[PDB]
Design an enzyme around this catalytic site. Structure first.
Site, PDB file in Angstrom:
ATOM      1  N   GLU B  27      57.734 -33.145 -21.060  1.00  4.77           N
ATOM      2  CA  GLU B  27      58.508 -32.962 -19.834  1.00  4.77           C
ATOM      3  C   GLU B  27      59.334 -34.207 -19.484  1.00  4.77           C
ATOM      4  OE1 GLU B  27      59.019 -30.120 -18.323  1.00  4.77           O
ATOM      5  OE2 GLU B  27      60.419 -31.183 -17.009  1.00  4.77           O
ATOM      6  N   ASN B  31      63.906 -35.103 -19.728  1.00  6.16           N
ATOM      7  CA  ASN B  31      64.753 -35.816 -18.768  1.00  6.16           C
ATOM      8  C   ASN B  31      65.361 -37.076 -19.386  1.00  6.16           C
ATOM      9  OD1 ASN B  31      64.237 -34.577 -15.721  1.00  6.16           O
ATOM     10  ND2 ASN B  31      62.520 -34.261 -17.127  1.00  6.16           N
ATOM     11  N   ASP B  58      64.917 -44.535 -21.669  1.00  2.00           N
ATOM     12  CA  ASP B  58      66.244 -44.282 -22.231  1.00  2.00           C
ATOM     13  C   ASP B  58      67.170 -45.444 -21.891  1.00  2.00           C
ATOM     14  OD1 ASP B  58      66.311 -42.855 -19.395  1.00  2.00           O
ATOM     15  OD2 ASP B  58      68.393 -43.253 -19.937  1.00  2.00           O
ATOM     16  N   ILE B  79      63.518 -36.633  -7.055  1.00  2.00           N
ATOM     17  CA  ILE B  79      63.249 -36.157  -8.419  1.00  2.00           C
ATOM     18  C   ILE B  79      61.748 -36.249  -8.759  1.00  2.00           C
ATOM     19  CG2 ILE B  79      63.703 -36.574 -10.898  1.00  2.00           C
ATOM     20  CD1 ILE B  79      66.548 -37.604  -9.892  1.00  2.00           C
ATOM     21  N   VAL B  82      59.785 -33.592  -5.537  1.00  2.00           N
ATOM     22  CA  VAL B  82      60.221 -32.244  -5.130  1.00  2.00           C
ATOM     23  C   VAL B  82      60.349 -31.345  -6.362  1.00  2.00           C
ATOM     24  CG1 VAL B  82      62.001 -30.876  -3.945  1.00  2.00           C
ATOM     25  CG2 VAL B  82      61.485 -33.211  -3.169  1.00  2.00           C
ATOM     26  N   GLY B  84      62.200 -25.800 -18.146  1.00  2.00           N
ATOM     27  CA  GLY B  84      61.494 -27.020 -17.768  1.00  2.00           C
ATOM     28  C   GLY B  84      60.880 -26.934 -16.382  1.00  2.00           C
ATOM     29  N   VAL B  85      59.770 -27.651 -16.188  1.00  4.79           N
ATOM     30  CA  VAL B  85      59.032 -27.668 -14.907  1.00  4.79           C
ATOM     31  C   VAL B  85      59.277 -28.918 -14.037  1.00  4.79           C
ATOM     32  CG1 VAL B  85      57.235 -26.235 -15.962  1.00  4.79           C
ATOM     33  CG2 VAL B  85      56.857 -28.716 -15.754  1.00  4.79           C
ATOM     34  N   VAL B  87      59.851 -33.493 -13.919  1.00  3.40           N
ATOM     35  CA  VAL B  87      58.980 -34.688 -13.927  1.00  3.40           C
ATOM     36  C   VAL B  87      58.078 -34.809 -12.694  1.00  3.40           C
ATOM     37  CG1 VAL B  87      60.547 -36.076 -15.354  1.00  3.40           C
ATOM     38  CG2 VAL B  87      60.663 -36.263 -12.835  1.00  3.40           C
ATOM     39  N   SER B  88      58.419 -34.109 -11.612  1.00  2.00           N
ATOM     40  CA  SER B  88      57.572 -34.063 -10.416  1.00  2.00           C
ATOM     41  C   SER B  88      56.175 -33.493 -10.699  1.00  2.00           C
ATOM     42  CB  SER B  88      58.252 -33.258  -9.305  1.00  2.00           C
ATOM     43  OG  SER B  88      58.405 -31.901  -9.676  1.00  2.00           O
TER      44      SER B  88
HETATM   45  O1  LIG Z   1      63.854 -42.043 -19.413  1.00  5.42           O
HETATM   46  C1  LIG Z   1      63.670 -41.215 -18.352  1.00  5.42           C
HETATM   47  C2  LIG Z   1      64.752 -40.634 -17.695  1.00  5.42           C
HETATM   48  C3  LIG Z   1      64.549 -39.819 -16.596  1.00  5.42           C
HETATM   49  C4  LIG Z   1      63.261 -39.584 -16.162  1.00  5.42           C
HETATM   50 CL1  LIG Z   1      63.002 -38.586 -14.759  1.00  5.42          CL
HETATM   51  C5  LIG Z   1      62.165 -40.132 -16.805  1.00  5.42           C
HETATM   52  C6  LIG Z   1      62.369 -40.955 -17.903  1.00  5.42           C
HETATM   53  O2  LIG Z   1      61.315 -41.515 -18.554  1.00  5.42           O
END
Ligand SMILES: Oc1ccc(Cl)cc1O
Ligand SMILES: Nc1nc2ccccc2[nH]1
Ligand SMILES: Oc1ccc(Cl)cc1O
Lengths: 188, 185
Positions: B27, B31, B58, B79, B82, B84-85, B87-88
């Site tokens: 997940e 992102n 990243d 983000i 609140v 794919g499901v 990162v919350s």
């Molecule tokens: O590299 C990333 C980019 C966006 C999110 Cl939400 C998490 C990460 O680990």
């Protein structure tokens, strides 16, 4: 409940000096007195357990258990999980909370941890009695420094409450040292 | 987030057999790939740490840091908190999560515990680099039996993603035993 978890101090009070810790008990006591006032006998029992949890029980009608049409969960769960300060604040700031509701001949049981129900409210058995019982373990992640219930703070407050609530029996029990008190005022 | 905490298996997958545990990584990786594509270098690094946490970084633009006008907190916090499901879900089921955002000349940091922010997203310094990094510690209250990350389950999925996302470099590092890979089409 995440609003309460974000800033516990704003809802319960100071979480270091012990005033917030004892406010957890008094919030639950206020709900129990409300339930006790509906009913004829009217007794509540506040018990300080050996593991530094506190239980508060009343012999009233029992808080509602039916599924809430909008929320889709038991009315009891709505009371425990939707935001005095409300019992949901006490639930949110408790690392464990046990709910036992005796109502319409049935025993209902549910367990929470940090405000999260571990399962839906379940009928586990049968009973002739009625009432609600909440036993909570204050979260040691929230409550620091002062993490133990002082008997005198509870005893003094419950005595003061007894004179405002006529006909309501209030029992205080300490299972750590066996100390007991019974506050009951009949005025009016 | 309480809907996720109430029924973790329904959002992340089975929390006993290791399926849910590894989906937590996937997940976050989704992102990270979206962010990597929008930047120039287009690289992601997934690191399995010795203490059984995983970090995904990243080198993209950095996720937005400004205040969300509706929610009244940082866009990054929206983000993370609140639904794919998303990162919350990962945040809600992590006993700790560290967020680091490098964006517009500044390093931003925030710590979560079980999805609860410990403080607001804060500027902690200056930097020329850009990107986002999330390191998360899976909640051992939720994830049982299979609590440790198997290297090959992660390697298998990241390989599949490298073919689909041909432009993106994906590095996998294991700090427990020094094992590593570099998936790039
Ligand atoms: O590299 C990333 C980019 C966006 C999110 Cl939400 C998490 C990460 O680990
Ligand atoms: N230990 C712990 N702390 C928590 C706070 C919110 C939800 C779940 C949690 N488990
Ligand atoms: O006795 C009780 C009655 C109502 C609530 Cl919410 C809690 C109690 O402990």
């Amino acid at each position: 409940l995440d609003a309460v978890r974000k800033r516990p101090g704003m809802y319960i009070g100071d979480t270091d000096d012990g005033t917030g810790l004892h406010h957890m008990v008094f919030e639950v006591v206020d709900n129990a007195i409300d339930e006790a006032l509906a009913g004829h006998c009217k007794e509540i029992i506040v018990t300080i357990h050996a593991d530094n949890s506190v239980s508060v029980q009343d012999d009233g009608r029992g808080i509602p258990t039916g599924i809430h049409p909008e929320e889709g969960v038991s009315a009891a769960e709505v009371i425990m999980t939707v935001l005095g300060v409300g019992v949901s604040v006490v639930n949110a700031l408790s690392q464990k909370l046990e709910l036992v509701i005796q109502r319409e001949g049935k025993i209902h049981r549910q367990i929470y941890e940090h405000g999260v129900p571990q399962a839906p409210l379940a009928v586990t058995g049968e009973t002739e009695k009625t009432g609600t019982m909440v036993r909570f373990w204050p979260s040691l992640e929230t409550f620091t420094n002062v993490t133990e219930f002082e008997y005198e703070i509870l005893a003094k407050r419950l005595r003061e409450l007894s004179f405002l609530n006529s006909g309501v029996s209030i029992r205080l029990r300490d299972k750590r040292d066996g100390k007991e008190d019974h506050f009951h005022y009949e005025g009016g």
